[PDB]
Amino acid sequence: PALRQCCNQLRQVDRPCVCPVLRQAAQQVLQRQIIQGPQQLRRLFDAARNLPNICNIPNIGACPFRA
């Protein structure tokens, strides 16, 4: 399970580093994968931004980092 493992890892990083590491994870997918267009790029970053909530990380909401 990708999500499960993802949340396990995200819970080990310092809370103030949660969004910065997710921004880097998003950039890695953008760089390493073929991102077809504007729509896919949007979904990629939406997915990354929402992980703190999807993973139920205490006091951290969706990361407002830019695409």
């Binding site: 990708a2 990083v13 997918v29």
Partner: peptide, 26 residues
């Protein structure tokens, strides 16, 4: 640093797979 933790946790490869699937599907 944050960039360091990213690298030391396999660049959050599991998160990358999840993000990539969401980008391709939905």
């Amino acid at each position: 640093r944050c960039q360091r933790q990213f690298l030391q946790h396999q660049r959050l490869r599991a998160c990358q797979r999840f993000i990539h699937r969401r980008a391709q599907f939905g």
